[PDB]
Design an enzyme around this catalytic site. Sequence first.
Site, PDB file in Angstrom:
ATOM      1  N   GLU A  92      10.504   5.437   7.804  1.00  0.00           N
ATOM      2  CA  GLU A  92       9.668   4.248   7.621  1.00  0.00           C
ATOM      3  C   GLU A  92      10.506   2.978   7.753  1.00  0.00           C
ATOM      4  O   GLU A  92      11.745   3.027   7.764  1.00  0.00           O
ATOM      5  CB  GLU A  92       9.027   4.281   6.241  1.00  0.00           C
ATOM      6  CG  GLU A  92      10.020   4.554   5.118  1.00  0.00           C
ATOM      7  CD  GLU A  92       9.482   4.096   3.769  1.00  0.00           C
ATOM      8  OE1 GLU A  92       9.496   2.843   3.462  1.00  0.00           O
ATOM      9  OE2 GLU A  92       9.014   4.961   2.934  1.00  0.00           O
ATOM     10  N   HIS A 151      -0.006   0.409   1.974  1.00  0.00           N
ATOM     11  CA  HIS A 151       0.874   1.172   1.082  1.00  0.00           C
ATOM     12  C   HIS A 151       0.760   2.671   1.204  1.00  0.00           C
ATOM     13  O   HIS A 151       0.560   3.401   0.231  1.00  0.00           O
ATOM     14  CB  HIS A 151       0.591   0.699  -0.399  1.00  0.00           C
ATOM     15  CG  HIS A 151       1.891   0.277  -1.006  1.00  0.00           C
ATOM     16  ND1 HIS A 151       2.791   1.069  -1.666  1.00  0.00           N
ATOM     17  CD2 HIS A 151       2.369  -1.003  -1.009  1.00  0.00           C
ATOM     18  CE1 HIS A 151       3.796   0.285  -2.049  1.00  0.00           C
ATOM     19  NE2 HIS A 151       3.556  -0.961  -1.676  1.00  0.00           N
TER      20      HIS A 151
END
EC number: 3.1.27.-
Length: 107
Positions: free
Chosen positions: A70, A99
């Site tokens: 990520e 999120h």
Amino acid sequence: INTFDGVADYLQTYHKLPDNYITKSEAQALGWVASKGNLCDVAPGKSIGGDIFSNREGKLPGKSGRTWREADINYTCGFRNSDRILYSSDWLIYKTTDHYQTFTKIR
């Protein structure tokens, strides 16, 4: 290079993240305190990116030998936001703006 399109092309064009990214651990080592939102004071122009993303929930497509990572997107000092780019070791690129709750393919 901190936009969804920028980083995706980059990841596929160069096979690494652009120079503006540093890992969490790397960040902590330079004085970053998550609770203070101080990343720009200790490392001007950098964003958190490159950490391994567990994919515990099995939300992203699995494959034996495939590793997910990520990177933060659209960061501009202060506390981190909710935008992230997710990229596999075989260069599949997903996006999340909530999120890591939901993901959509971008490359």
